[PDB]
Design a binder for this molecule. Structure first.
Ligand code: HEM
Ligand code: HEM
Lengths: 117, 117
């Protein structure tokens, strides 16, 4: 078929989504402190890689596995819900059709919690 | 098309998956304490409803929204990963083809964290 990545506009679309996503995440006073020690330019690059790779683009994901990145930080299920919500909101802002937003959340969310099955 | 629910065997298949899922969840010493105060027979019924409804079956979900059920329990992102993993494992045990397991996790996981977009 066509990849989800291609369907939404390829690399540029991923960049747009990720930038808007991080605005929403870092604006959230329940989340922002988690990123106090983070190399943010590197993180955003890695997130573009993760999204692009997961949605079927040619970009390699060169980052770490999700469990090993996220563990030991005190991130709650509530925090995950907030993040997932900000992602859905960024895809909406970007103009992604709603059924494709659902598809993307369905690809990304399980991967974010180390399910690949 | 056909619903995911129909594709996997309808109501009976949901019942099989849910029973095996709860064996895995309650066997997990990191999760089992969360259910100490729970009406378990009612919960399993509600989970069958949730899965069946979410996968396109005729069964109404009569339970509560995910945020309102799960909040204030100290459930972590790690706990969610464990649960999602047990779900994938139950679908594998049940013999669901792997691409359909991926589809199901993609439907269920975002709903579990109150994303509908
Ligand atoms: C859909 C959900 C999520 C996805 C896809 C995701 C993905 C990623 C990726 C790709 C990285 C970069 C990994 C690397 O550098 O190798 C990362 C880092 C990070 N994530 Fe997430 N993540 C998610 C949810 C969360 C949540 C809920 C939190 C809670 C605040 C969070 C906090 C972090 C932090 C703090 C880092 C950076 C660690 C550091 O370099 O200092 N993430 N995530
Ligand atoms: C895919 C992930 C999940 C789904 C789809 C899910 C779904 C549900 C549903 C449908 C109920 C019943 C709601 C009602 O009675 O109205 C429920 C209750 C519950 N869930 Fe989850 N859940 C998920 C993840 C988790 C996780 C990660 C925990 C951590 C232990 C958890 C703990 C509970 C508990 C303790 C209850 C019962 C509250 C009670 O009646 O005493 N769930 N969940």
């Amino acid at each position: 078929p066509i990849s989800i990545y291609d369907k939404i506009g390829g690399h540029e679309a991923i960049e747009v989504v990720v930038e808007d996503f991080y605005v929403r995440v870092l604006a959230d006073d329940q989340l922002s402190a988690f990123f106090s020690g983070t190399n943010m330019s590197r993180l955003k690059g890695k997130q573009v890689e993760f999204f692009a790779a997961a949605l079927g683009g040619p970009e390699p994901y060169t980052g770490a596995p999700m469990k090993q990145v996220h563990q030991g930080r005190g991130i709650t299920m509530h925090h995950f819900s907030l993040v997932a919500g900000h992602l859905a909101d960024a895809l909406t802002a970007a103009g992604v059709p709603s059924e494709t937003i659902t598809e993307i959340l369905g690809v990304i969310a399980p991967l974010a919690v180390d399910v690949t099955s």
